Structure 1
Amino acid sequence: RYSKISDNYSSLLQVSEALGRAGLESSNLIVGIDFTKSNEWTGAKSFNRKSLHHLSNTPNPYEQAITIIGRTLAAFDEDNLIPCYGFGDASTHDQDVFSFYPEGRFCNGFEEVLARYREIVPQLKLAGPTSFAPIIEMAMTVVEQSSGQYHVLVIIADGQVTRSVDTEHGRLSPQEQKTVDAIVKASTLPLSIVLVGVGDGPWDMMQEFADNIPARAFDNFQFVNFTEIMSKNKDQSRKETEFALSALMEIPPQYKATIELNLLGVRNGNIPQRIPLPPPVQ
């Protein structure tokens, strides 16, 4: 379905224009980056056996994903301030996020996101396990503190939420419990959540995962497999529009739903204030 749409899109400008015509207005971008140790080996097939966070003269999947989404959403934020966080390194595990800059200062444009990313990466101790509760709660806090301005949180991760050892008997892990709770609670705010999967995964359980999130006032969650799209036999420009469309096509209807539900522009009042840790660098 997204492949059919993308056959008519040769540039990310066209995709931005389409989001606008579909009714997307002012949108702020929030980025969260997975810094788990698994990144070392999930690039087996998808990244020629290199770490997903390997730095070189060609962008790694994190840099690519940031670049495509950042470029596509740029038109919807006049000054492109991007709150950016890491999670899953030794300083945060599954409990916290850290801000890219001290005192939680926002990045000025995706270009600075990318530059700061490259500075931080070699200084991190990669760890785990995997929960998206902290990054989503951080996004919730930013949205509340902005007085209900519309935000898109983009999480780029190399694995599904950590499961229980006893998942076969229906047991959820605390990572799953807290992440699903956060997704549901986030739907009380004008916030869209896009989970971008990079690396080899596996990612086969994601559509079932999304299908099983409890009922919400609007569907505020999307998963997109960057790896699968970017592995296809298309021109580079057309793989990028397909990825941008698969990640962001559902954002204009979600935006319109936040207006219909009168979430836009107001404080919910029941959002605990998550504090981002400092970047574990120097």
Structure 2
Amino acid sequence: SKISDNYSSLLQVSEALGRAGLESSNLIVGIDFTKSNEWTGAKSFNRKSLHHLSNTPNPYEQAITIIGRTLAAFDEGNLIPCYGFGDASTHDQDVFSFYPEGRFCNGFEEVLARYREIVPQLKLAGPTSFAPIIEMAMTVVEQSSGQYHVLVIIADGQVTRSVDTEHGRLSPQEQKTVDAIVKASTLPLSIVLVGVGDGPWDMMQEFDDNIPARAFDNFQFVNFTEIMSKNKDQSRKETEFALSALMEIPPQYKATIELNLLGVRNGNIPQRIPLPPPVQ
């Protein structure tokens, strides 16, 4: 079924996870390095690229930071695989790992630093598909033999489509991404989409709420730019991000149990190999 917002506070989600008996989880990070990032900051980031580095934090950095402050507990070893995608070296075909021989990030401090070290060495390209980052997360979950993971994707949300067409028919990047979201539901994987820039967000909301062919609701959408733009403290913006990020975790974790996915190896998950980072 489709999972509504069933928690109105951060504490409520805590308690549901407590009743759910969650003992173990890990995180995987995916970052959109597609070229749309250069204009999806028109309204929300002062006509600067969403990946532009300067004296002020860009929205990817804010997301990397807020994520580190709020969601940290959900990676049991503070060791996080990270992956870029959409850059010139992977296009809509591959991902690349943040580090040469697979090595993971030591906490989100490193994710922020490694992100800073990397993004201006990149050619932002495309097209935009989520199929490779999601298939990479699948391989990850499959190799740990069914250990529960949450995939956090930070992206401007503009998966490649055509403007008109209004067909309601899917581009190749739309079909491969949807086919991935459906395939991922045969594994203990939660997907969390952290959306930055101006949007529009109608596709991300479709991924969140309306993907009939999947076995359970495995996708959540977070409008980061909405949460940040609001009228309140920095504290309460972080609580709000965390509630939004975690809103579907308890149902989805229970689904991985009731659908027999947790700790179960699927056996039909193709082994995706990440590319090394295209950097120095």
TM-score by length of 2: 0.90
Larger displacement relative to structure 2 (55-64 or 17-26): 17-26
CA contact (8 A) 2:32 2:154 kept: yes
Q: Which runs of 4+ in 1 moved over 4 A?
A: 3-23
Larger displacement relative to structure 2 (120-129 or 53-62): 53-62
Distance change in 2, residues 1:4/1:193 (3 Å): closer
Distance change in 2, residues 1:208/1:8 (3 Å): closer
Distance change in 2, residues 1:118/1:10 (3 Å): farther
CA RMSD of aligned residues (A): 3.4
1:118 to partner: Cα distance: 0.5
Give the distance between the partners of 2:63 and 2:15, measured in 1 at CA.
19
List alignment gaps of at least 5 residues for structure 1: none
Superposed, which structure 2 residues align to 1:1-282 within 5 Å?
Answer: 19-20=17-18, 23-164=21-162, 167-282=165-280
Distance change in 2, residues 1:65/1:4 (3 Å): farther
Distance change in 2, residues 1:11/1:173 (3 Å): closer
CA contact (8 A) 2:71 2:242 kept: no
Distance change in 2, residues 1:102/1:237 (3 Å): same
CA contact (8 A) 1:12 1:240 kept: no
Give the distance between the partners of 1:91 and 1:43, measured in 2 at CA.
23
Structure 1 residues 202-247: Cα deviation after superposition (integer angstroms, max 9, x where no partner): 1144334433312322211111111111111111111121111111
Give the distance between the partners of 1:270 and 1:6, measured in 2 at CA.
30
SS, match of residue 71 in structure 2? helix
SS, match of residue 162 in structure 2? coil
Give the distance between the partners of 1:215 and 1:26, measured in 2 at CA.
28
CA contact (8 A) 1:15 1:244 kept: no
List alignment gaps of at least 5 residues for structure 2: none
TM-score by length of 1: 0.90
SS, match of residue 202 in structure 2? coil
Give the distance between the partners of 2:188 and 2:226, measured in 1 at CA.
29
Larger displacement relative to structure 2 (60-69 or 199-208): 199-208
Structure 1 residues 161-219: Cα deviation after superposition (integer angstroms, max 9, x where no partner): 21145532333111011000000000110000011110011114433443331232221
SS, match of residue 119 in structure 1? helix
CA contact (8 A) 2:20 2:254 kept: no
Give the distance between the partners of 1:18 and 1:29, measured in 2 at CA.
19
Give the distance between the partners of 2:141 and 2:189, measured in 1 at CA.
7
1:256 to partner: Cα distance: 1.5
Distance change in 2, residues 1:236/1:21 (3 Å): farther
1:159 to partner: Cα distance: 2.5
Paired-residue identity, %: 99
CA contact (8 A) 2:37 2:50 kept: yes
Structure 1 residues 1-29: Cα deviation after superposition (integer angstroms, max 9, x where no partner): xx999999999899767755664431100
Give the distance between the partners of 1:14 and 1:5, measured in 2 at CA.
16
1:68 to partner: Cα distance: 2.0
Larger displacement relative to structure 2 (238-247 or 203-212): 203-212
